[PDB]
Assembly symmetry: D2
Homo-oligomer: 114 residues x 4
């Protein structure tokens, strides 16, 4: 199935934060309405934050996360979970290698903000 | 129900990260096997990452998150989600006020690392 | 925090299924737009299905699950999970006793159908 | 990523329930320790419960869901959710066609029971 694609409410600010757990430099691209809105880059094996930003979901609300490492797209796993009918998490894990730990870049999207 | 309590695998490193979305200064306490292991604080209405840390779950794997604002416990919501039977997120929201956005402090725990 | 309340897309059919795991007879009510839409009751300690129905979320999309045992409201815990940005689960557990298993009535809502 | 594979606690009873939403007849197989322990088949476009069963995770705890339509495997999506650190849902959707609704067979596993 497609992974890393989420429909947010329109015109809504959301947070996006990425963590790295890999020897490879992770490049995380966040696309809003099909256009690149943020790009994070970094390397850690200790869950460092490699980027955080606040974005607006725009007219459609479409948000897509993509991850690549040494020019190759990582395999993604994702889900959205909603707590108390209010608090939304869009979660992505990614795998750049052969161990299927799926933590190589971890991306958390959360809304609402404020 | 009790919220903000998670059983992790024993002797496992995990990340804990907190975000703020409130006019009130948030204080986030992270307990591991019933003793404080990390404390984060800050004040933002734009999702600032007020703290992030790597901890070890220790022998019994018990991790608890508590949130307070001006000495008053916040009401918590939480859940754990597991992707591809590998990648774990323990999620907490909290409410310090009257609007029930539950984002006033948001805490994300992730494992495994590395 | 409020539990067992979910906002569905309007005019959408959804399934609701309830299971029992308790010595007490479980009464499960499903409200749509603040009005009773379905009621199930039964008793099992081995996960029997005590009710299943297809409902329409109607003009409001507002769905609430309530659980009680002989006039005593059970404590609920709930969350919504979305897979591949398409497949939705609204999940409820409930506790009628002292063991905090939260399985005494379990309610699963899923959409879309068809 | 692998989907539909879950690690349960050993020697633990769990419920498994399957729903259908497709013109095609769904075949759902639930494997415990790599052998089929339950099978359900049926056709519905209205979320029929094509089967429910209580199984034991046995000595290994590995549980796998497979879905096919006249022998053709369906693509799966899955996740596990844990509420109040005690109530577990393992969730599966599947796609047999071209519309990406992922509801063609839906499988929910819950534990603990009793
Ligand atoms: C009927 C039965 O199962 N008897 C068991 C006894 O079971 C208890 C135990 O399950 C407790 C857990 O809190 O709950 C008692 O029931 C209370 C109700 O709880 C609900 O139903 C339960 C069955 C659980 O599903 C629970 O999660 C639910 O919340 C509650 O709603 C109600 O208001 O009050 C009830 C109590 O009045 C339930 O009776 O457990 C004992 C100890 O395990 C069993 O005794 C043991 O039996 C084994 C054989 O299996 C053996 O004989 C052993 O020596 C003996 O101690 C008893 O059979
Ligand atoms: C039988 C039926 O429902 N006929 C409908 C027609 O429905 C389509 C549509 O649902 C597509 C979606 O991809 O799938 C067709 O079935 C395919 C199988 O898909 C599975 O079953 C489906 C019912 C869905 O659940 C889907 O999610 C499943 O994956 C697939 O497994 C198989 O390999 O191939 C199948 C054929 O492609 C299904 O037939 O939809 C049309 C258009 O909406 C309906 O026609 C409209 O009917 C209304 C009245 O309701 C009115 O008459 C209107 O004018 C007319 O266009 C048709 O009745
Ligand atoms: C003074 C100001 O900025 N006014 C804008 C107003 O802001 C409100 C509104 O957000 C309400 C929502 O309940 O909360 C008030 O703040 C609370 C505070 O709530 C916390 O902080 C908020 C910013 C928000 O994040 C809440 O979710 C959070 O719980 C409480 O903690 C505190 O005890 O009491 C204060 C005061 O009541 C905000 O001041 O929002 C509107 C709507 O956008 C704007 O028009 C105002 O300019
Ligand atoms: C540290 C390690 O990084 C990543 O794996 C890399 C991979 O991206 C790259 O292409 O190739 C190397 C060498 O094989 C990988 O590193 C090894 O990964 C092993 C596990 O598969 C093991 O961790 C070795 O210690 C590494 O040298 C990640 O995909 C991996 O999860 C892990 O974080
Ligand atoms: Ca990896
Ligand atoms: Ca890794
Ligand atoms: Ca608030
Ligand atoms: Ca807030
Ligand atoms: Ca109970
Ligand atoms: Ca019970
Ligand atoms: Ca389909
Ligand atoms: Ca379908």
């Amino acid at each position: 199935a497609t992974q890393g694609v989420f429909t947010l409410p329109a015109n809504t600010r959301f947070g996006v934060t990425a963590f790295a757990n890999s020897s490879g430099t992770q490049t995380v691209n966040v696309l809003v309405n099909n256009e690149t809105a943020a790009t994070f880059s970094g390397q850690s094996t200790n869950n460092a934050v490699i980027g955080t930003q606040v974005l607006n979901s725009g007219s459609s609300g479409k948000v897509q996360v993509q991850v690549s490492v040494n020019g190759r797209p990582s395999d993604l796993v994702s889900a959205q979970v909603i707590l108390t009918n209010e608090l939304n998490f869009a979660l992505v894990g990614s795998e750049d290698g052969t161990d299927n730990d799926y933590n190589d870049a971890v991306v958390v999207i959360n809304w609402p903000l404020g």
